[PDB]
From a paper:
Herein, we identified from a library of lipases/esterases/acyltransferases and variants thereof a [name] originating from [name] [name]-200 ([name]) able to form amides in aqueous solution starting from a broad scope of sterically demanding heteroaromatic ethyl esters as well as aliphatic amines, reaching isolated yields up to 99% on preparative scale and space time yields of up to 864 g L–1 d–1; thus, in selected cases, the amide was formed within minutes. [name] is a hormone-sensitive [name]-like (HSL-like) protein adopting the alpha-beta hydrolase fold, with a helical lid domain over the active site cavity with the catalytic triad. The common Ser-His-Asp catalytic triad was located at positions Ser159, His281, and Asp251. Mutational and structural studies revealed that an aspartate next to the catalytically active serine is highly beneficial for the observed activity, which has not been described before, showing that a catalytic tetrad is actually required (Asp-Ser-His-Asp) for [name] for efficient amide formation in aqueous buffer.
To gain insights into the mechanism of amide formation catalyzed by [name] [name], its structure was determined by X-ray crystallography. Diffraction data were collected under cryo-conditions from native crystals, as well as from crystals soaked with benzylamine 2a or the amide N-benzyl-2-pyridinecarboxamide 3a,a leading to data sets with resolutions of 2.0, 1.6, and 1.8 Å, respectively. Furthermore, two funnel-shaped channels leading from the surface to the catalytic triad or actually the tetrad were identified. Next to Ser159 of the catalytically active triad, an aspartate (Asp158) caught our attention as it is not present, e.g., in the [name] from C. antarctica B (CalB). The aspartate next to the catalytically active serine may represent an extension of the classical triad Ser-His-Asp/Glu42−44 in the [name] mechanism to a tetrad. Furthermore, the crystal structure showed that the enzyme possesses two access tunnels to the active site, probably one for the ester and one for the amine, another feature not described before. This feature allows for bringing together two sterically demanding substrates, the ester and amine, without interfering with each other.
Residue numbers in the entry:
A (entry chain B), B (entry chain A): 6 to 314
């Protein structure tokens, strides 16, 4: 068997008992609704936060909606985090990841901008990376900041890495000073021991990954889909976290190892005994709160080191 | 050309203009004196520290001299750092690394115990790793502490990793909670691009390394000489730092990568634009002070997270 935290095993037993269709049997609209209802039941609320503002920004295929979270709006010019939500490029929105964004804004003490990027299958690859890169450049130009911290979970961890590579090659008005990919997808291939071990029973399944991947319809040769296939030299200091029961664990490790081999300062964290998707499950999995807090404390120090030097 | 900090360049200009024999042209006694005099000229002094105590402990072969540094001797039982000096298993002692150990004890706010292990060629491999393991067990059994933090530079980085692998397999009376190998040697072979790039003009030279290697006479197939060839699973949280102009940089990268691939939580830092040996050169290379302080701040947080269990 595999080490599993007791509260994770308890939440898994709950997930395994639910009646009614799997996500992969649903059209996108119904999958999108499943995730909202799961968040309502198993995520914490937003909690208290001084400022949350929505607006539209111009992007190349139309307006991109963003949400700015700031718990200390009187700050001076400092770093800003841009956040790209997960949901396999099909599901997720500004509300599914709202409680995480707010928590991040509170712990990091920096403004957090979440991007509502275009989703498949209505907008297949490469709409998501186009939107994310355009939003991030807009932020560097238009928001008072000294530097960008890019972060995202799962599909959004992918978008974090691909966006950091596009800005490494052609810089924004402000540098990326750090990146925080959370349980990222970095490749489209499934030849991984963690994929054989954990591809059933652990929230993210073989069935649901196939479903995501077919709708997004990514070009597997393109760096925007498969950044483990391309040089990593000159990326900023990276905090990469994986979850030990996650079918994507091993490609996360492999990416972190590639970063170290290219000389990129890297902090690898593994949430031991927990599953993919934990950053939105902090009420159903209470130990998730310490994983969130523990990673963002390390990130806060990484950013403080980059700004003090 | 390779990025080089201006103050490192300036130190190297001075070192390369020195007259008088190279270390490798000397018998061990004369090499040992060169290192003491280099430290005298290019290291910071011990500075203020509440307590420094010298004693002998019983070892497998006789007395092992140790030195205890504590900047807060009143403390409650907490973590203790055991430190293994570098010098290619031939040179170095308690005085060569004294200013670093005091600095660590101040920044980490924990006791630091430096070990004077047996040196080659009078005592070839495996004397040093046996002594280090024996002293570390003595500390766990005899000094009030809750856990051990092992650290060391170069040969001493090797001894840190080897010692942690020995205690992973048969634990001391107290757990290892973190390890901090500083520009470690993890193999005896030289097939590394960094070795071809930086094996002359950067303080640690091909000639030095061969001279150390011949005196130590390590068995290249033994885990105690070549830890990179053996499983890393189940080591504690590791902070591994390399210097970018070091002949040993690439094997250090490769070890940090292997730790990540085994699921060990790992922070990799690279001192960009600096050389091997910088922890003893903080007066001749003033930027070394921020490399020391930067790493020890990270380690201190790693330990704080472990002891909040």
């Amino acid at each position: 068997t595999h080490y599993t935290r007791p509260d994770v095993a308890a939440f898994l037993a709950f997930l395994n008992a639910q009646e009614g269709p799997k996500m992969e049997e649903m059209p996108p609209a119904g999958a999108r609704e499943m995730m909202r209802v799961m968040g309502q039941l198993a995520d914490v609320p937003r909690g208290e936060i001084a400022k949350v503002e929505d607006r539209m920004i111009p992007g190349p295929d139309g307006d991109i909606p963003i949400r700015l979270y700031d718990n200390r709006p009187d700050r001076e010019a400092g770093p800003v985090m841009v956040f790209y939500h997960g949901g396999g490029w099909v599901i997720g929105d500004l509300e599914t990841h709202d409680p995480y964004c707010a928590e991040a804004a509170r712990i990091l003490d920096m403004p957090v901008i979440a991007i509502d990027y275009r989703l498949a299958p209505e907008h297949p690859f490469p709409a998501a990376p186009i939107d994310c890169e355009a939003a991030t450049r807009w932020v560097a130009d238009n928001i008072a900041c000294t530097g960008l911290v890019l972060s995202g979970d799962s599909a959004g961890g992918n978008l974090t890495i691909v966006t950091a590579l596009a800005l490494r090659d052609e810089p924004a008005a402000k540098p990326v000073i750090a990146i925080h990919p959370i349980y990222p997808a970095v490749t489209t291939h499934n030849d991984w021991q963690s994929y054989r071990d954990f591809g059933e029973g652990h929230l993210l399944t073989e069935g649901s990954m196939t479903w995501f991947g077919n709708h997004y319809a990514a070009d597997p040769a393109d760096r925007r889909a498969a950044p483990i296939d391309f040089p990593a030299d000159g990326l900023p200091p990276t905090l990469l976290i994986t979850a030990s029961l996650d079918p994507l664990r091993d490609q996360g490790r492999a990416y972190a190892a590639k970063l170290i081999e290219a000389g990129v300062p890297t902090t690898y964290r593994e949430a031991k005994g927990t599953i993919h998707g934990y950053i939105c499950l902090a009420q159903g999995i209470p130990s998730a709160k310490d994983d969130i807090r523990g990673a963002l404390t390390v990130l806060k120090a990484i950013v403080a080191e980059a700004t003090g030097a």
